[PDB]
Structure 1
């Protein structure tokens, strides 16, 4: 919910710096990812409604124990709000931030063998919307810069024409590029249209609307932080600053 609310590149990377890896990993068993299932949608149909479960749903799924599953759990958390079930990763890796895993070699995780095409296909890039594809491409660029695979990232964009048009423009080592970026990455937000307490047909759409309706409740909740009215009560370390720089950028 909090990760889906971020609407700018600066906010997204700032959230990932303060968020540990354990938030990406889920400890609920879930179900196997790719299955043709029948779900109940009584608002629309009397018969059961066919659908296919996927990894970018908002509900936890079972994940492979390899490094591929860990990266695929991080991206699903960013684009869908929930991760997958990969237990016994370890204290050392789980305490690191999401940005450290994606960008830093000191974590101890080796990810240079990853194939962006296979990861995108397993994440069902075809079913993703524009904001979801932009968020995943941000994760790919950070991984490419960590492994020195910038050339491979560019070629993968050349093969996929729709991905090249929406590819965010920022150098993963320079903070000046992040501040200038004006891409809108928000998935949930205050809706200008009429939003009703109604169900959706597919699993992805229904789960997304739950976060959208939950965010509205979160926005008016006491947990939400109102910068306009309570800026002085925020701690100085985590207070918003114009000259905000990620470490090493």
Structure 2
């Protein structure tokens, strides 16, 4: 809910630096990602409404234990607000922040073999709005410059002309580009009636939209009560035990 309200590249990057990977992942099994299902939308139809599940719905789904699974969960969190279920990630990765997973080499994750075309297909980029595509391209560009695969990012953009039109105009190394960026990446925001939408993505997105006004006021006190005497998880000092399976 907080990641969706960020409307600037500066605010989105600042949030990712503060947020650990734990809130990008989820601990709920969910269902299989791609599946033709019939859902009940009684506000419109007596019959069951056909739809296809995906990873863009704000609902947890099963993900494999690999770098592709971790990347998909991070992007889904940015573009949808809810991550995926990757089993037993490990303490060392969960304590790192999202941006360091995307842009730093000390995390212990190899991302040199990522295929951008396959990730977009798996994330169903076709059923994404303008804001979501921009956020996905921000994550792709950060990974591309981290591993030196800047050429592959350009090849992917050239193959997808519509994405090339709305691509972000920032260079990850430079800071002048981030300061002067003028993109609008906000998905949720204060304005809508308490009604139901037909699609799973549209219904879940509207649920975030209607709950943002209430979340703006109620989160302050309830949060502060939780970590009144709690040590911050992000970059927590430890004995640096091990990283298993990566």
Same fold, TM-score > 0.5, yes or no: yes
- CA distance in 1: counterparts of 2:79 and 2:31, whole angstroms: 19
SS in 2 for 1:37: strand
CA displacement at 1:220 relative to structure 2: 3.8
Answer whether contact 2:9 2:181 (CA < 8 A) is retained: yes
SS in 2 for 1:15: helix
Shift in Å, 1:235? 15
SS of residue matched to 1:85: coil
* Separation in 2, partners of 1:230, 1:92: 21
Distance 1:222 1:79, change over 3 A: closer
Gaps of 5+ in 1: none
For these two proteins, the number of residue pairs brought into alignment is 246
Q: Indicate how the Cα distance of structure 1 residues 79 and 242 shifts in structure 2: closer, same or farther if over 3 A, else same.
A: farther
CA distance in 2, matches of 1:54, 1:181: 31
Instruction: Indicate conservation of the 8 Å contact 2:92/2:240, yes or no.
Output: no
Offset at 1:73? 0.3
Deviations 1:93-152 (Å, cap 9, x if unpaired)? 111000000000111000110100000000000000000000000000000011001111
Shift of 1:159: 1.0
Query: In structure 2, what is the equivalent of residue 155 of structure 1?
Result: 155
Residues 90 and 243, structure 2, Cα contact 8 Å, conserved in 1: no
Relative to structure 1, is the Cα distance of residues 229 and 168 closer, same or farther in structure 2, using a 3 angstrom cutoff?
farther
Check conservation: 2:95, 2:235, Cα contact below 8 A.
Answer: no
- Assess if the C-alpha contact under 8 Å between 1:54 and 1:123 holds in 2: yes
- Following superposition, the deviation at residue 67 of structure 1 comes to 1.2
Deviation at 1:224, TM superposition (A): 8.7
Cα 1:224–1:14 shift into 2, 3 Å: farther
Farther-moved stretch of structure 1 (169-178 vs 136-145): 169-178
1:176 Cα deviation after fit: 1.5
Q: Which residue of structure 2 lines up, in the alignment, with residue 189 of structure 1? A: 189
Structure 1 residue 160 displacement after superposition: 0.6
Task: Give 2:244's match in structure 1, choosing from 237, 241, 247.
Answer: 247
Q: CA deviation at 1:70?
A: 0.5
Change (3 A) 1:161 1:70: same
Q: Secondary structure at the match of 1:158?
A: helix
Q: Could you tell me whether the CA contact under 8 Å between 2:21 and 2:95 is conserved in 1?
A: yes
- Per the alignment, residue 227 of structure 1 pairs with 224
Give the whole-Å Cα distance in 2 for the aligned partners of 1:232 and 1:46: 52
Using the alignment, how far apart are the partners of 1:129 and 1:6 within structure 2? Answer: 16
Instruction: Please give the per-residue CA displacement for 1:172-197, whole angstroms capped at 9, x wherever unaligned.
Output: 01221101001000000112xxx000
Partner of 2:38, secondary structure, is: strand
Measured in 2, the distance between the counterparts of 1:244 and 1:9 equals 35
Q: Contact conserved, 1:134 with 1:185, CA < 8 A, in 2?
A: yes
1:212 to partner: Cα distance: 0.3
SS of the residue aligned with 1:105?
coil
Alignment deviations for residues 23-49 of structure 1 (CA, whole Å, 9 cap, x no partner): 100001100000100111011011111
* Alignment check: 8 A CA contact 1:14 1:246 kept: no
